[PDB]
Amino acid sequence: AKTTQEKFDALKEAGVFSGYPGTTDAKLGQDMTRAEFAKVLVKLFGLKEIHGQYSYKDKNYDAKNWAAPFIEAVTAEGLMQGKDLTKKIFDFNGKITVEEASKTLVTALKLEPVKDAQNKATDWAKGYFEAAVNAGLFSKDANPKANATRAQLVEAAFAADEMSK
Ligand SMILES: CO[C@@H]1O[C@@H]2CO[C@](C)(C(=O)O)O[C@H]2[C@H](O)[C@@H]1NC(C)=O
Numbered sequence: 002a003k004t005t006q007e008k009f010d011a012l013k014e015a016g017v018f019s020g021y022p023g024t025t026d027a028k029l030g031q032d033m034t035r036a037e038f039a040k041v042l043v044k045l046f047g048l049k050e051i052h053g054q055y056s057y058k059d060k061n062y063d064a065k066n067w068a069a070p071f072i073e074a075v076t077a078e079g080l081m082q083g084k085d086l087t088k089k090i091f092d093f094n095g096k097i098t099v100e101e102a103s104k105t106l107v108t109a110l111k112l113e114p115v116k117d118a119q120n121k122a123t124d125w126a127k128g129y130f131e132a133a134v135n136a137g138l139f140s141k142d143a144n145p146k147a148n149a150t151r152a153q154l155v156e157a158a159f160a161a162d163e164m165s166k
C-alpha cells in the first residue's frame with residue numbers, strides 16, 4: 002500500500018496523467034480544469050477519442066482546442082453533460098469539483114446513486130457524492146462543492162481503476 006505520489010507515478014506511467022512542462026513535479030496541491038479531467042477520464046476508461054466534432058458552444062471550443070476529442074468522448078459516453086443544456090456550455094476552463102468528479106466516476110463504474118442522501122453537495126449531486134463516498138473514491142469530509150485537488154483526483158482515479166477488475 003502505496004502513497005499518493007506513487008499512485009500518480011503509476012497513473013502517469015499508464016498515460017492517464019501527464020504532469021507539467023519543465024518539471025517532474027506532480028503538484029498534488031493544485032487544481033485541474035474540466036478539460037484536463039475529461040482527458041483523464043478518457044485514459045482512465047479507455048474511451049475512444051472523437052475528432053472533427055464539436056458539441057458545445059463555449060468560446061474557443063473548436064478544432065484548435067486540444068481538449069475537444071476528449072470532451073466529445075466523455076459526452077458520447079454519458080459521463081459528462083456540461084453545465085447547461087440550453088446554452089450548450091461545458092466550461093472547459095473551469096475547475097473540476099469533487100461532486101462533479103463524483104458524478105463521472107459513479108456513472109462510469111455503474112454504481113447506485115443514493116436517493117435522499119444527506120450531505121453538503123449541490124442538489125443535483127447529492128446521490129452521486131454519497132455513492133462516491135461509500136465507494137471510497139472521496140473522503141466523507143471532502144467538500145463536494147470545492148475544486149478537487151490533484152491529490153484527491155489521483156486517489157479517486159486510482160481507486161476507480163481498481164474497481165474495474
Ligand atoms: C499546462 O500543461 C498541461 O498540464 C496538465 C496538468 O493536468 C493533467 C491532467 C496531467 O496529466 O497532469 O494534464 C496536463 C496536460 O497534459 C499538460 N502537460 C504537459 C506536460 O504539457
Ligand SMILES: CO[C@@H]1O[C@@H]2CO[C@](C)(C(=O)O)O[C@H]2[C@H](O)[C@@H]1NC(C)=O
Nearest residue numbers: 080081082083084085086101104105125
Ligand atoms: C451546473 O449544472 C451541473 O454541471 C455539472 C458539470 O459537471 C458535470 C459532471 C457534467 O455533466 O459536465 O455534471 C454537471 C451536472 O449534471 C450539472 N449539469 C446539468 C446540465 O445539469
